């Protein structure tokens, strides 16, 4: 038992996307994050493909649940759904 | 004499904020181009860091003059500004 929590997880290349918008608020709430190494394999990058354009912001994910990216990920934490979002993810 | 015309460059990080619409027009008349690993020095991250936004297309530089980059460089090509501007670049 690592973590009571879940695991998240974030769609974007080591450095230069500039992913700094979803690393941002995980960083002032210390949450946890894991990077993905796109146009890399056609499994991702055709994921990443979709949600892709004007190289916005990455993509984040949460358990069993899809996140928009950066646009929902601040948005939740407004409205204050960013505390559940991390330890269970939900989409409520 | 290797070129009676002038060199030309733009500002984008090799493979990642997706120059390829820079690209895209100066591969359609075979014209020359330089990029800038962007990143790394604060002297390019702070001109970049005023062009940038939403990861949008890079910037052109034609020797003297600014360009806003994919925008105006696809401009001028529309009204014909793009001869005389690989060859001296002006912005008249
Ligand atoms: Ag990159």
Redesign the interface.
């Known amino acids: 038992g690592p973590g009571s929590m879940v695991d998240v997880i974030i769609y974007t ?1 080591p ?4 992913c700094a918008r979803a690393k941002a608020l995980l960083a002032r709430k210390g949450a946890e994050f894991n990077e993905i190494d796109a146009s890399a394999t056609p499994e991702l990058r055709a994921e990443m493909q979709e949600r892709s354009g ?3 912001f990455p993509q984040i994910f949460i358990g069993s649940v899809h996140v928009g990216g950066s646009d929902d990920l601040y948005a939740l934490e407004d409205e204050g759904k960013l505390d559940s979002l991390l330890k269970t993810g939900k989409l409520i």
């Open positions: 290349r450095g230069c996307p500039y004007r190289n916005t």
